Symmetry: C5
Subunit: 152 residues, 5 copies
């Protein structure tokens, strides 16, 4: 499984952009990422910006717009895509993931992937720390801090 | 709660499967006007032959005029060949690229369905929800956040 | 379409694998542009390349040499015993989208990605099918005009 | 008949599955020389460990010297993992990119097969047709059309 | 018989599945030093949380220092969601991009497997061949050919 770090980033500025489809799963993820950065990495509450966009499709664009306006040491993109009856899931999952990798590489700002691509709601909730699962948001918080520091 | 009386929105839609396209365009327009105070004269509506032309039509139009947000609308239905799989992927990638290259929010109004029924259901027919409404709200929201 | 493009310059690049299917497609695109959209025969350049893989590159080279208002890329890819079909279908389609977006010139997709010969011939107007080359011709004129005017 | 006595051709090939690679390189070279009058000293041949390095080895080489066309040759065989699926796609994409970025025609000589037999058959063994010959002609034609 | 006593090599590896990663890194390093005369001081070893961070970690590092070649090592195992499919593809595409953008050879040391056993087997355990050895030799070769 994952192997996080014990790094401190009191001076890091971190941006979190999350979609709003499936808020039930999004909230615990955001909260986990924030709590872990503060309590475990000494990031300051004032240095964490939180923005939202309607859906996962908008994540790469929202992130790109925000890092052009302000300066961040790392960004976490959070969203939940659930397979439905159409091929929508397959095609936008791929476009969004590609989009996030591009924004990070174009800008030089680490973009941490907080995108869940699941078959059903249960899988999402389970990865958000509910029903006995592990909250992946925590890992994302630690990844952001680590990448923020290594980025300089 | 978001109002954009000064927003300029572009809507580019393909012409294959007009039966499903029209309700989507209409739903988007009605929602922006009636619920976000966008002005009818501030909404440009253009069309292209098919979904393949969507990225290019949008790229050309945003180079000519200035818009706060764009909605690309089309309907791709799986057929007997592999056409559907390969162009769906290319068109979706194309739309993301035009949005990122230009800095202009591009809202995805592309239905990629197995059959006609699925598209109509997502256009508000037969008891379904009209996704066009969601796209209009998204365009307004992204347009405002874009500044 | 009631659109006329007597001043449009159109480029058609087609591959040579499966000429049986390629010819009717090219022919249908040309005849439609001329007879239905008043494009002038002398304003239509026709070029060929060995295979679909070369399509994006041939188009990129040609639109850097001359000026065109719209381009139509024509090729036929048929599923074989290897994964060749799946991988290059995807790369070629992506390449044609890229060339159109990089250059600003409308690229009409005239690429058939079929499971067998019959599907391609049918889409070329044979055996009771509709010739897709006609639609491509009309799309190139429309996009050419909207490219500018 | 296309003749290119003044063309400079580059051939970069991987080294995994040499049994299939050699005949492909050989067919491409023999065909350019014997049928298109390309000069032996005008053909550079380079190798890289595997297919993954093909795009990078080609990019490096066309930055150093000037070539009219390039042929990238390699063989990918489906194995037990998903490696085949993911690098086949990335390599093919990488080869298309290098060609478009540079303006130098890149001919695809990458076989993506399910097993060894399929690759040998396409290299001209066991009653099959050597695809290397086709690639040689394609490079000459694209080399001349590139100017 | 390639020797690169003056080569500077960078190795960036993720930390998911350390059980498989360590043997891979070790095989790569040992092979470069014992078989290609690369100096232990000239090998930088960095890590990142997961495979998703590999392309970015590598890009940041080759912007700071100068390396003749890079090896990106990570292990992606198929799970219950579609995560594996989507990020395997994006990471592989990402690594090819960083290598083509920068001009620095990037050796793919990414295992995309269906289960833990497949990964350990490819790391030289349970009778398998250590793929890290192959990657170390590829890096030396591409580093030397890169000039
Ligand atoms: C049919 C359909 C299904 C969608 N499913 C999701 C989903 O599961 N998760 C998500 O974040 N956004 C989803 N979206 C929203 C998408 O990311 C975006 O807001 C819209 O396509 C318009 O840009 C969906 C949109 C559509 C039209
Ligand atoms: C065989 C075939 C099937 C097509 N199916 C669709 C479709 O379902 N929806 C759509 O908007 N366009 C479709 N198109 C049109 C495509 O987006 C484009 O206009 C044309 O390929 C010419 O560039 C299709 C074109 C072809 C050749
Ligand atoms: C195994 C194999 C199958 C091919 N199938 C097609 C096909 O169906 N259509 C086409 O235009 N070209 C095809 N090509 C040619 C390809 O588009 C191209 O010319 C060359 O592969 C690299 O120049 C094929 C090439 C190979 C090696
Ligand atoms: C598990 C595995 C399977 C591979 N299979 C192939 C293959 O079928 N063909 C090929 O040219 N290279 C293959 N390679 C090598 C690849 O092209 C490249 O040299 C290395 O991955 C390091 O970049 C493979 C490498 C690995 C680790
Ligand atoms: C559901 C899930 C599965 C993951 N699986 C892997 C894996 O198999 N290998 C790996 O290196 N990283 C894995 N990661 C981590 C990923 O590469 C990355 O570090 C994090 O998503 C933060 O951007 C996974 C992350 C998630 C959320």
């Amino acid at each position: 499984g994952p192997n996080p770090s014990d790094l401190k980033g009191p001076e890091l500025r971190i941006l979190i952009v999350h979609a709003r489809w499936n808020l039930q799963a999004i909230e615990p993820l955001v909260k986990g990422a924030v709590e872990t950065m503060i309590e475990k990495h000494d990031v300051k509450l004032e240095n964490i910006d939180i923005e939202s966009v309607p859906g996962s499709w908008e994540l790469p664009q929202g992130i790109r717009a925000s890092i052009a306006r302000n300066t961040y040491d790392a960004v976490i993109g959070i969203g939940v895509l659930i397979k439905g009856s159409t091929m929508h899931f397959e095609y936008i999952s791929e476009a969004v993931v590609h989009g996030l990798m591009r924004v990070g590489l174009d800008s030089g700002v680490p973009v941490i992937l907080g995108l869940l691509t699941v078959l059903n709601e249960e899988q999402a909730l389970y990865r958000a720390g509910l029903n006995g699962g592990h909250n992946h948001g925590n890992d994302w918080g630690s990844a952001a801090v680590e990448m923020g520091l290594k980025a300089l």
